[PDB]
Amino acid sequence: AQVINTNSLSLMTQNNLNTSQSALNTAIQRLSSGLRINSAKDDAAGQAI
Amino acid sequence: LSASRSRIQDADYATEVSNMTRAQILQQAGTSVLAQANQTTQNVLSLL
Structure with a gap:
């Protein structure tokens, strides 16, 4: 069963790239700024305290 | 009076050295x- 009209491994792989591409971003930001809690997105009560 | 104005206006030095060091390190890391x-986006080209 070789189908030319659609490839499905490419999509499965594309998702994993997006998964990694966000961990890279968070690490980059935390190294550039100097703090781990840069937004309320990160720890709701820690920012308040 | 001289002592009191000194208390108002003078600059400490220990704190300033500490701040200068802190600022240099962070600038270098940044x-x-x-x-x-900036070096992140090149790998796209190989994909072609």
Whole structure:
């Protein structure tokens, strides 16, 4: 069963790239700024305290 | 009166040295990581 009209491994792989591409971003930001809690997105009560 | 005005206006030095060191280190790290991040998008080209 070789189908030319659609490839499905490419999509499965594309998702994993997006998964990694966000961990890279968070690490980059935390190294550039100097703090781990840069937004309320990160720890709701820690920012308040 | 001289003593009291001194208390108002003088600058400490220990704190300033500490701040200068803190600021230098962070500037250096930022420069390195900015180079690193700019270096991120090249791998797209190989994909072609």
